[PDB]
């Protein structure tokens, strides 16, 4: 069988209007997955995974991560959700919706004999005015006021399914972030990623949840003769083992005399004694390590009335050091008093459902914390854990950037009008696609009132009319009533950093996707 | 490219283009010449008095061994569009002249073989084809220069018998070298029309019966049919035949249209029985009233007729075929009578002894007529010891009859044995240099091709072609060109005038003309579009 | 009869036609991405990896070709990247057209050897003509030619911004890495510039770092993450417990010495790790690793110890900070040295949070003041294209600084050459005037392609361009129309010198020489034999 002379065997090409409109249609399709996960009246989405698990959430990023798409253009929108998850907290659903609209308005102009570079250029210019406008309508935050900070958090957990217990979640998030405000060298940091541990234990009710002034580990004591309750322990943290091991060499010890066998074994016992004498010179109460503890080592530790924990994970041991103030050492022979975790509080090993949990709490001034969650099952515990992650990120955000923007749709309307008033003096071909950006901005209050069952004509017509005046500029959507209320009374305020990034991502997303005129598929790499 | 365009799309021009083949260049021309070599290598092996025979096995398993190129080439399974034309060349020669079934293939092949060098020299393919015409005219014009005959077709038939011997000498019937030569001459001259020089092929019938020997082949001045006397006790000998040729069955006449006779009464039933009896008597007496004593009927007989034929001493045969009663009526000078009631003595045939011949243990009962009155038709009766020699004998006598007809059409002859071909090659060479404008190479190639015949004859005769050709060509120049040819046994000298090797002028004129035209129509091709597999 | 070669053999006009198609199938790929009015491509492999690009190099490297005539154009693109560094789009477009026109000459019975001869004469004269119509060196334009050259190279890339944000970062990054070698070689080794990616803020918040950015982490969470007035210790040996070599074995007949032998394995390590810190070093860089015992001594000492960094980056830091890399002990059978006086410096070494990840910066370095660029994009697709776009822009500015000569862009070079060669073809037009004229005509594919991609009338817009370039050659009244190009945004001619549209001289002279050689080679493959692989026997 003589083949046809070809190049690039088993490859495909698509080009032209089938791509220019194709890639936009792909973005329009994926955008609808989380359309109903924006406002305070959202519904829960039940997602099934191939492993046999169930995810119940209304978080836009968690939902999209579980969706596998085939279209190479839809994959780009998934990457957008990945970026937002790390840069901002609650800048999720509104970004995918707005980004889709930036492409929708592009399709209109692209089919009207306009070169893609004119559409792209017009959007790039509009960004400068949307960012400039947002900075002019912000309000400074006095982050030292407990009530202002709690209200900011309340506005970020309202959308999520734990808003029913806002009087608990708001206090959990605010204090948990404060406990991880670091300043040791010349740099201020808020670390809510390495030390902000959330520990969920099935059982009880959500109203039982609390924040621990310290840490907890799911470990028991090595030996029942050791104390399970120490009011004011001297805590020493080790990284080394208390065992004797053959070295990484070719050591060969000849047993030739009657006593040689037993003499070697005696020295092995003496090794353990040498370690035991060095780790008690500081008169510790508690020794926590990561590696094994020999039976002989326990003999001496019991005589010293020392409580020992055997095999603590590295991520837990570093967190213990921050809570109790101890130093972790890897050479027991160089232990010093400066290593002892003074200022630590109660050590108590408790039983929760016939399972042991060791609590190290009531510390003077810990730099790490654990949030203890209780609930009926993993269903509610998973919902709470994820929602607290967002609350601590939003608290952290305003603590580093103390500026709020009037939210609930008020921001998007004010910016859309600012764009319109400037567009009057463009006097060029870009005048029209410039104005198109202002129209795209209105999708946010539109979707907020659609998800509430309200008229899309009565509210948006009146709301747009109210933003013709220069007095208020804070008219938005009341997601509970279905009417229009001045945001100065609703109290819905959103971080400036989230609003600035929302516009930057939406415009730059379009810049990438509007430049693709040719899709090549079917090649392999070597 | 096909099935792939620069834009990645399929590119389809003609149906199933991926199953086609095209190659033009000089490769189409070399492929045509090369394929012709395979054909020429076959026929060259059966040229000359030592020509070897071919065994042809038919698709049904039947086998016949022949020498006649018409029977060799017609049974080929060659699937090549140009090689098939080489067979048509031998057909055209067979239809017009009937002799050179081997020669035209060998000559045409030589023209294609010698042309091979001309293409490699860079000579335009068409200029080669035209160059052969300029040289061919020279050979043809000189071919008509040397010719003479003393044949008058009256009594001095010596050179006519010699022509038949020359033709038959190449066949497998040399055991009858003289006998069949004389039969062929007598067969044609007794039916040929001297006024127009026409010979009607239907006036010579060729029959045969397996058994005996070739030496028993006879020429019968009359007709041979399958005799089957309707009455087994009827005398089998008529000394003086008065022959009634009838095309009506010996049964009561019936209408051709729908009849459906209505019979009602017993008088009607019985009356018909009588009337029908009378019809049987009348139809026989109507023959006797004419003096006839032998009836030959296309149709059969009723049982009632056979008894009446006996009692009236009226022999007859049954179911004699269309062409048989046609030939009998002509050979005997009679006419075919439609009905019984139209019989008259004036339409009776006249013939002498009528007998049937029994052959060994079989029941063939073949007719022989001894005497006739100014018959214009003859029958040849071929015998032989096996089926193959008889069928080949039919072709051997056919060729002998054809060359006699050709001399009647045109009585100009030439000397054979290669003398005509060598002389033509020398004549073309002499004029090939008058003038060497462009065609010098082509005209010389033609002259060389003409020698393929005495060279192949020399090889089949057991001689070296260089030792033979160089001597004859020198002798034809050193002295006034004699009719000097070649032979295997040399017969003393190679003087064709003394060996009596006689060939027809119009035969060779057609061999040169037809071979040249066939070469032209297959040189001037540079594209073959043959389909491949079905799917 | 036929050859007994077991493959497939094609001769004559079969291969002479196929090579034209195969070459066109490659030029058709990049023709659509020429100029600022071109559009990008998305390349998706069989397993789902998506690459965004518009450059001829990346596209042709990723896309597989099979015809031997197509590999020639792919190699041509690869050579342009090596020799020049940029411009890798016109070498495929022009080279393919040279074959297309040659095919027309061959089918007219113009002997292939006379086609090749004529092409070489036209190329040599084109090199002369462009070298006689140069604009200016880089001394009169100063920094203006560098900002303009940067923005010109960006006009077709994702960083094609209207402003000077990136143009300033590129020009200053190249000028900041000036290293003069012997005999007056003020080189700008842009290959030493570390370009970093992160999916974060918009493009206009990318950073230009004075110093070096090292893709590493502090590691053990007890070390300082900011050091001011740091001494930098570069070394390349393992800070690990001491190991024995396989050729030495410990054979004990007196167990009393066992404990001392075991102890030695840690005594050597703990002493050496402290004696390198008694030197005053603040930041320790190693390409090996630091084990559990060794980390204690760096933490308690208040030192920053960075482990498992790439050797290619440590060598760059050591040169920029003035440090010597320590690999072993010296001083001619000295006890222990550690070359205490050979530490480097930096004003600040700090770990920052870059899109929820960790990056350590070394500020200003105080010896050579190297540069590093940290790009911000919205997603991974942009970040990869931005890195490629920055690399190109850095290379163009380097070439302008090293080769102090600029030529006009906008197709002005090709238009001018297309006329000069026509006069050469007439003056020497004996038997090769057909090949020379066709070479000249092929040059117009560049202003033609640009007009088509801009959706302009190609036959009018480009014809007008040639009218201006002709007048200044046939009416020698100092018309000064020889530097006019196409304005693809208005469909009108522009003065490229006043418009700021400059390109290097070498991207034109070298492209003509390289395309000529490839165009000649492809014309001498009249026959093709392909052998069947030893697969089916």
From Swiss-Prot, chain A:
Disordered: region residues: 1-21
Against Pfam families, the record matches this protein to: Cpn60_TCP1
- Which processes are annotated in GO (biological process)? binding of sperm to zona pellucida; chaperone mediated protein folding independent of cofactor; chaperone-mediated protein folding; positive regulation of protein localization to Cajal body; positive regulation of telomerase RNA localization to Cajal body; positive regulation of telomere maintenance via telomerase; protein folding; protein stabilization
The chain residues annotated with the modification Phosphotyrosine are 244
**Disulfide cross-links:** 363-369
Carrying N6-acetyllysine, the residues are 219
Recorded hits in InterPro entries, A to Z, give: Chap_CCT_gamma, Chaperone_TCP-1, Chaperonin_TCP-1_CS, Cpn60/GroEL/TCP-1, GroEL-like_apical_dom_sf, GROEL-like_equatorial_sf, TCP-1-like_intermed_sf, TCP-1_chaperonin
The record's Gene Ontology cellular component field reads: cell body; chaperonin-containing T-complex; cytoskeleton; cytosol; extracellular exosome; microtubule; zona pellucida receptor complex
EC number(s) per entry: 3.6.1.-
Q: Which reaction does it catalyse?
A: ATP + H2O = ADP + phosphate + H(+)
Please tell me which top-level EC class this enzyme sits in: hydrolase
Q: Which UniProt keywords apply?
A: Acetylation, ATP-binding, Chaperone, Cytoplasm, Disease variant, Disulfide bond, Hydrolase, Intellectual disability, Isopeptide bond, Nucleotide-binding, Phosphoprotein, Ubl conjugation
Cross-link Glycyl lysine isopeptide (Lys-Gly) (interchain with G-Cter in SUMO2), residue numbers? 12, 245-246, 378
Q: Which residues bind ADP?
A: 39, 91-94, 159-160, 408, 479-480, 494, 499
Task: Recall the GO molecular function terms of this protein's record.
Answer: ATP binding; ATP hydrolysis activity; ATP-dependent protein folding chaperone; protein folding chaperone; RNA binding; unfolded protein binding
Phosphothreonine PTM positions: 427, 456
The record lists Mg(2+) as bound by 90
For this protein, the record's PROSITE patterns field holds:
TCP1_1, TCP1_2, TCP1_3
Q: Does the keyword Zinc apply?
A: no
Q: What does this protein do?
A: Component of the chaperonin-containing T-complex (TRiC), a molecular chaperone complex that assists the folding of actin, tubulin and other proteins upon ATP hydrolysis. The TRiC complex mediates the folding of WRAP53/TCAB1, thereby regulating telomere maintenance. As part of the TRiC complex may play a role in the assembly of BBSome, a complex involved in ciliogenesis regulating transports vesicles to the cilia.
Q: What does the sequence similarity comment in the record state about its family?
A: Belongs to the TCP-1 chaperonin family.
**Record's protein name:** T-complex protein 1 subunit gamma
Which species does this protein come from? Homo sapiens
Q: Could you tell me the gene encoding this protein?
A: CCT3
From Swiss-Prot, chain B:
Chief site of localization? cytoplasm
Cross-link (Glycyl lysine isopeptide (Lys-Gly) (interchain with G-Cter in SUMO2)) at residue(s)? 15, 205, 209, 260, 270, 274, 387
Keyword set, alphabetical order? Acetylation, ATP-binding, Chaperone, Cytoplasm, Cytoskeleton, Disease variant, Hydrolase, Isopeptide bond, Neuropathy, Nucleotide-binding, Phosphoprotein, Ubl conjugation
By its UniProt entry, which Pfam families does this protein fall under? Cpn60_TCP1
Coiled-coil region list? none
Q: Which disease is it linked to?
A: Neuropathy, hereditary sensory, with spastic paraplegia, autosomal recessive: A disease characterized by spastic paraplegia and progressive distal sensory neuropathy leading to mutilating ulcerations of the upper and lower limbs. De novo genetic variants in nearly every subunit of the TRiC complex, including CCT5, have been found in individuals with a broad spectrum of brain malformations, and clinical phenotypes ranging from mild to severe epilepsy, developmental delay, intellectual disability, ataxia, and other features of cerebral malfunction.
Write out the similarity annotation.
Belongs to the TCP-1 chaperonin family.
Tell me, how does this one assemble? Answer: Component of the chaperonin-containing T-complex (TRiC), a hexadecamer composed of two identical back-to-back stacked rings enclosing a protein folding chamber. Each ring is made up of eight different subunits: TCP1/CCT1, CCT2, CCT3, CCT4, CCT5, CCT6A/CCT6, CCT7, CCT8. Interacts with PACRG. Interacts with DNAAF4. Interacts with DLEC1. Interacts with SPMAP2.
Question: This chain belongs to which protein, by name?
Answer: T-complex protein 1 subunit epsilon
What organism is listed for this UniProt entry?
Homo sapiens (Human)
Swiss-Prot record, chain C:
* Xref: SUPFAM superfamilies: GroEL apical domain-like, GroEL equatorial domain-like, GroEL-intermediate domain like
Record CDD domains: TCP1_alpha
Which residues get modified to Phosphoserine? 4, 489
Q: Which InterPro entries match?
A: Chap_CCT_alpha (IPR012715), Chaperone_TCP-1 (IPR017998), Chaperonin_TCP-1_CS (IPR002194), Cpn60/GroEL/TCP-1 (IPR002423), GroEL-like_apical_dom_sf (IPR027409), GROEL-like_equatorial_sf (IPR027413), TCP-1-like_intermed_sf (IPR027410), TCP-1_chaperonin (IPR053374)
Q: Which residues bind Mg(2+)?
A: 86
Enzyme group, top EC level? hydrolase
Q: What is its EC number?
A: 3.6.1.-
Can you cite a GO biological process for this protein? Answer: binding of sperm to zona pellucida
Which pathological condition is tied to this protein? Intellectual developmental disorder with polymicrogyria and seizures: An autosomal dominant neurologic disorder characterized by a broad phenotypic spectrum. Main clinical features are developmental delay of varying severity, intellectual disability, seizures, and polymicrogyria. Additional variable features are non-specific pyramidal or cerebellar signs, and visual impairment.
Quaternary structure? Answer: Component of the chaperonin-containing T-complex (TRiC), a hexadecamer composed of two identical back-to-back stacked rings enclosing a protein folding chamber. Each ring is made up of eight different subunits: TCP1/CCT1, CCT2, CCT3, CCT4, CCT5, CCT6A/CCT6, CCT7, CCT8. Interacts with PACRG. Interacts with GBA1. Interacts with DLEC1.
Q: What is this protein called?
A: T-complex protein 1 subunit alpha
